[PDB]
Amino acid sequence: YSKDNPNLLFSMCGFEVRILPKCRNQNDEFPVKDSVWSLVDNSTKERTAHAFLQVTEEDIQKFNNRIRQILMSSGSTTFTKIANKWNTALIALFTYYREAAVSTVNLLDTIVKCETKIQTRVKIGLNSKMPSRFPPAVFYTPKELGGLGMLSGSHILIPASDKRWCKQTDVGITHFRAGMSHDEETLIPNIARYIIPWEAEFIDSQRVWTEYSQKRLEAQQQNRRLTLEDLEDSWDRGLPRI
Amino acid sequence: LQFSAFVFQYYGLILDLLILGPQRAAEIAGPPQSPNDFLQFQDRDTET
Amino acid sequence: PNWVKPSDSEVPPLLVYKWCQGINNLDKVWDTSNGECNVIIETQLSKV
């Protein structure tokens, strides 16, 4: 970083980071997403920078190789086993790389192709590749209802054709349908939406542990012992957790 | 080996002394009485 | 000392975050009017 190169580049522990300060910015409008990091100066408590995060190409290839190893494994012909291995790999990838992962186009393409390869393995196990033969309910139904219980990092449509069910009551057959006269389709949920981003948990961990320090000092002042009751809104909170 | 992490972190600490130099390593690590936090110094004097 | 990682106090994303916050909290780190430059070198100890 110099007089005429305003970006600071590094890579660390999976994350490719570009630090840009909020002084040498030609962009008057800030496209700040969850991946972008507001770096706060403590002596002013002022957001002076923005660390853009991405996942390195070596780690995208690491995830791809993990899926290839899953697909070459010994138990990779049983559909529940292959689905569980895919679920473990996808959970590990997203819960590690979070907002940096959602901002990497190559990583999302790799996730789509690897999920397609897992489903293709399931289909080849049945000697078919017909897309109408395997609706999203075959893969993404939870294991409780007999489905595979796969989690998706892709964006998959659920058509209105797979939204009907009939029931035989004492007066005859009634065909019920969810979504009466609605031209849109529900999509399979994205796993990345169900994980809180890293910067959010850093800020909340700071807030929660300072409140815990205050609570501990005031509780030892009145000589009472800390319990579960006064720590309820900060239960699954903090790094490390309360 | 089970203790290889410990032995290599100590050996790499010695190599960190080689890379930094003992005086700058002492300034970064802080005094033994009051060790510094990660990526922080006592004052803007010693940092610069 | 504090520079020796993996430390038990943080996950590696928190290590990257503290690297970013420690870069941002250095004295006049972004001031480059007087010819100052910031160098960051990331390397590996070969065959260590």
Binding site: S213, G238, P240 | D37, L39, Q40 | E10
Partner: peptide, 25 residues
């Protein structure tokens, strides 16, 4: 047990110092 209380307390300041990295300084 007093010793057990001491070393569980030691876990407690270990977790607080893990959470208070940089904020303590």
């Amino acid at each position: 047990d007093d010793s057990e209380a001491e070393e569980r307390a030691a876990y407690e300041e270990a977790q607080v110092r893990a959470a208070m990295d940089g904020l303590r300084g």
